[PDB]
Amino acid sequence: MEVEKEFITDEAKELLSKDKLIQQAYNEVKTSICSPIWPATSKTFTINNTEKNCNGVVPIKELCYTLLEDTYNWYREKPLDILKLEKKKGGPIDVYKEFIENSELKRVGMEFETGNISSAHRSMNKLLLGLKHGEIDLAIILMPIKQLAYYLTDRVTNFEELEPYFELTEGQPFIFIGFNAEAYNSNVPLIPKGSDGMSKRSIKKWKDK
Amino acid sequence: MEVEKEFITDEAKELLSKDKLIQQAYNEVKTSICSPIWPATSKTFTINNTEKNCNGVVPIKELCYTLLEDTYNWYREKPLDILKLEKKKGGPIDVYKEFIENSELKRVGMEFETGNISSAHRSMNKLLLGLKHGEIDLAIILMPIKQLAYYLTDRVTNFEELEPYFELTEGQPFIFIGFNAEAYNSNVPLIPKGSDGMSKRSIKKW
DNA sequence: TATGGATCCATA
DNA sequence: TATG
DNA sequence: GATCCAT
Ligand SMILES: [Mn+2]
Ligand SMILES: [Mn+2]
Numbered sequence: 001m002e003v004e005k006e007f008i009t010d011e012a013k014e015l016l017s018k019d020k021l022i023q024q025a026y027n028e029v030k031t032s033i034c035s036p037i038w039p040a041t042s043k044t045f046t047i048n049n050t051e052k053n054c055n056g057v058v059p060i061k062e063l064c065y066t067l068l069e070d071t072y073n074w075y076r077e078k079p080l081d082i083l084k085l086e087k088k089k090g091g092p093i094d095v096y097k098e099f100i101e102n103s104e105l106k107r108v109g110m111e112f113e114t115g116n117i118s119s120a121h122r123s124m125n126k127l128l129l130g131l132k133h134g135e136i137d138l139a140i141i142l143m144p145i146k147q148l149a150y151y152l153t154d155r156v157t158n159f160e161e162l163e164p165y166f167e168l169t170e171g172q173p174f175i176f177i178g179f180n181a182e183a184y185n186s187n188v189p190l191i192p193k194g195s196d197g198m199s200k201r202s203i204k205k206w207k208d209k
Numbered sequence: 210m211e212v213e214k215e216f217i218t219d220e221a222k223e224l225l226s227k228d229k230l231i232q233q234a235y236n237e238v239k240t241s242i243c244s245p246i247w248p249a250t251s252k253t254f255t256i257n258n259t260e261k262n263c264n265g266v267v268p269i270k271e272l273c274y275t276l277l278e279d280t281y282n283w284y285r286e287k288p289l290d291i292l293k294l295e296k297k298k299g300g301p302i303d304v305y306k307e308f309i310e311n312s313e314l315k316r317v318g319m320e321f322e323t324g325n326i327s328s329a330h331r332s333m334n335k336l337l338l339g340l341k342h343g344e345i346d347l348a349i350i351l352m353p354i355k356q357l358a359y360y361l362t363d364r365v366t367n368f369e370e371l372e373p374y375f376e377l378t379e380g381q382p383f384i385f386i387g388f389n390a391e392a393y394n395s396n397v398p399l400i401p402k403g404s405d406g407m408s409k410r411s412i413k414k415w
Numbered sequence: 416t417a418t419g420g421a422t423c424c425a426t427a
Numbered sequence: 428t429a430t431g
Numbered sequence: 432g433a434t435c436c437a438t
Contacts, residue, residue, distance in 0.1 A: 056415075057421070087373040091418045115420045118431085118432085121330035122419080125374050153422055155432090161430080164296040165334050167341075193415040193422070198437085261416090266433070286431095300430045324431070324432045327419080331431080355416060362434055370418085406423045407435035413423075417438100424433075427429075431432045 001036040001045045001064075004145050005159045005178035007166050012173040015138060021099040021106040022138060026175070028074070029110065032067040033142050033179055036060055039188055046183040048190045053154045056193035057114040060152075062200065064112060064142070068095060075206040078109065080126070082133045093126060096136075096206060109136035113143045113157040120157035124169065131172045138173045145178040153193065210245045210254045210273075213354050214368045214387030216375050221347060221382040230308035230315040231347060235384070237281045238319060242351050242388050245272040248398045257400070258393035262363045265402030266323045273321060273351070277304055287318065289335070291342045302335055305345070318345035322352040322366040329366040330374070340381045347382040354387035362402065 008016065015022040038045045038059075048054060068074040074097040083090030095110040109130050111123040120143060127139035141162075149158035159178030166176055191197060203209060217225065224231040247254045247268075257264055277283040287305035292298060308315040318339050320332040329352060336348035350371075358367035368387030375385055404410035 053423085083373055089369065089373045089417090094419085116325070116327060116422085116432095118325060118327040118331045119420065121334055122327045125330050125334070125377060128377065129374065154424085155422080155430085160298065164292055164298045165338070168334055168337060193413075194436090196415075197421090262435085298429090303431095325420095325434085328431070328432065359416060364418085364420090364435080365433075367416090369416085403424065403433060405425090405433035405435090407421075408423080408433080409435090411423050411434075415422095419437095421436075422434090425431095 001034050001179050002182060003030060003033060003177055004180040007163070007176040009169055009172060009174045011171070012138060012175050015173055019106070021101055021104060022108075025097065025099055025106065025108045025138065028068065028072045029140055029142070029177070032064045032072065033177060035067050036063040038181075038191065044182040046185050046188045047148065047151050047181040048186055048188050049151050049184040050186045050190070052150060053152065055152050055191040056197035057153050057156055057191070058197040058200065059191050060144075061112050061114055065095075065203070066201070069204040073097065074110075074204075076203045078206040080130045080133070080135050082129060082135065083126070090126065092206070093130060093136075094123070106138070107136045108138045108140065110140040110142070113141055114152075115157060116155050117157045117161050120162045121165070124162070124165065127174070128169060128172065131174075138175070139169070140175045140177065142177045142179065145180045148180045151184070210243050210388045211391060212239060212242060212386050213389040216372070216385040218378055218381060218383045220380065221384050224347060224382050228315065230310055230313065231317075234306065234308055234315065234317045234347070237277070237283075238349055238351070239386075241273045241276040241281065242386065244276045245269055247390075247400065248396065253391040255392040255394050255396060256357060256360050256390040257396045257398065258360050259399070261359055262361065264361050264400035266361050266365055266400065267403060268400055269323055270321045274304070282306065289339045289342070289344050291338050291344070292335070299335065302339065315347070316345045317347045317349065319349040319351070322350050323361075324366060325364050326366045326370050329371045333371070333374070333378070336383070337378065337381065340383075347384070348378070349384045349386070351386055351388060354389050357389045360393070361400075
């Protein structure tokens, strides 16, 4: 899989330029989002393009999550204090990791969005809430680009559609990443939908795993 | 329907307390949200409570919209300039209306929310863009409270679930109102459902 | 009465 | 179409 | 948007 579109707020730009931990975080993310391949035996991600919305979205995220968790030690389901403790209403953040160098601690919150475009709004708002409350130092959202989305489940989050809203993160360190497949071909099998598209293995939860 | 819950930002509070036009607008939207009744032959709204998530949601906003449009002259599906003209990406807001008292103009934008709770985030953000871009002077969202939502299609917007995010509108004139039915009872009807998404009636080729 | 999806619908 |  | 699904 490969990164094609991207928006980085001025605050995130600053971090990326002068902070080694953030640079590291960003690189781990980038490598992970580029790792998904299809089919399982391929070196690149070729999406079946027989028709509009022909592919499921779940199997697409597995390799990226696996690398983040197993190779880079990122955790899943990190509850935000303001939601879990304070307002006691709201779910956790998708992916999370604490980077450390001596006395410096950098907490990065991330969301791999393949849900409906409206869900991307909730994901952005939750990360924004965490950022505004000083719980994370950087927020990231990964999502397919419009071209790729065309062959995935209808209405799935896509870079272009959420783009008009990136400006609501102004004043905060935020990175939006849009990925695309390397090839489009009807020769590869369809990414399964529903039950058949799952497995998703035992994940590394922050509560611990 | 009846208004059971409500959150009014401090900016909206000032408008409501001081501005006549905003008061009129607020008044109009409230009568409108109270409007929807069920069944048709009734003067109140009674939700069928036979089972959790047993009622569809589509018919619920009809009367609300009717009043606003016909009786109050609100405009449906108003496209915001930032989205339609500037960004050329994104759809319109549910209802909009300009209140005029010569020299003074107040534009109010509103979103009736019965879509999935995630969709409420898109609605709130769109109203936020409008506000931020000075296209509206007040934003309002209408949505069922959890108690009522319990008998509507699963995961539809409910006041309590969007509540933890109300703070993202700090500094903007925003009003969030949660409506509820007058009664939960036996009935001749049950609000019908569409074949959307995972409904057993939807076509799934897989 | 929790909560983030995943998948399909209607109408431009 | 693209968008709620 | 509107219906359900997996935890
Ligand atoms: Mn709308
Ligand atoms: Mn609406």
